[PDB]
Design a protein around this ligand. Structure first.
Ligand SMILES: *[C@@H]1O[C@H](CO)[C@@H](O[C@@H]2O[C@H](CO)[C@@H](O)[C@H](O)[C@H]2NC(C)=O)[C@H](O)[C@H]1NC(C)=O
Ligand SMILES: *[C@@H]1O[C@H](CO)[C@@H](O)[C@H](O)[C@H]1NC(C)=O
Ligand SMILES: *[C@@H]1O[C@H](CO)[C@@H](O)[C@H](O)[C@H]1NC(C)=O
Lengths: 50, 50, 49
């Protein structure tokens, strides 16, 4: 059993229309930069988060 | 009854029970940055609190 | 007309090279700590980015 909270997620749709991956945008600062860049890949560097 | 600053937001208030003046401060403050070597290389990150 | 003596002169020149670096938290400026305003502002995220 687990409990739901209001969150913002970044969901990924493949070319067939199925959700294959997701990012929880408020888990980590890393996840926050993923959410901002709107990508699952981050290049080397320093990013302002929030 | 209320005190307002330059941005016109309320920053002081008289308590209606004890008649004492109280200051109001926001509780979100301070800049954050994240350092990553690239998601391709690793998931380890560093965080800078400015 | 030919000069017969000289003068050695030192003068100064001033140049700007850089300015202050700034960053903005868009939600902090627009909404403060209001959750409802943030839910409304989620429609304009591209502009803050
Ligand atoms: C060339 O110019 C210099 C100054 O620019 C002269 O030197 C000065 O000479 C006077 C008297 O002749 C002195 O009272 C000053 O103290 C000197 N100044 C320095 C810095 O030494 C020099 O005499 C000039 N030479 C000629 C041939 O005119
Ligand atoms: C998408 O659909 C095609 C055709 O049915 C299938 O071959 C493929 O495995 C499906 N998945 C992906 C990720 O393409
Ligand atoms: C109201 O109640 C508070 C606490 O019960 C008391 O200190 C105060 O004297 C009361 N009267 C006024 C006018 O605040």
């Amino acid at each position: 059993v687990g409990y739901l909270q209001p969150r913002t997620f970044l969901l990924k749709y493949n070319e067939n229309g199925t959700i294959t991956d997701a990012v929880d945008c408020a888990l980590d600062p890393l996840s926050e930069t993923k959410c901002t860049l709107k990508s699952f890949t981050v290049e080397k560097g320093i990013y302002q988060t929030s | 009854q209320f005190g307002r600053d330059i941005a016109d937001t309320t920053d002081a208030v008289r308590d209606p029970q004890t008649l004492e003046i109280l200051d109001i401060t926001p509780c979100s403050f301070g800049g954050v940055s994240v350092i990553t070597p690239g998601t391709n290389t690793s998931n380890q990150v560093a965080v800078l609190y400015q | 007309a030919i000069p017969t003596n000289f003068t050695i002169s030192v003068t100064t020149e001033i140049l700007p090279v850089s300015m202050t670096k700034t960053s903005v938290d868009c939600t902090m400026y627009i909404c403060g700590d209001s959750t409802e305003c943030s839910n409304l502002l989620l429609q304009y995220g591209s502009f803050c980015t």
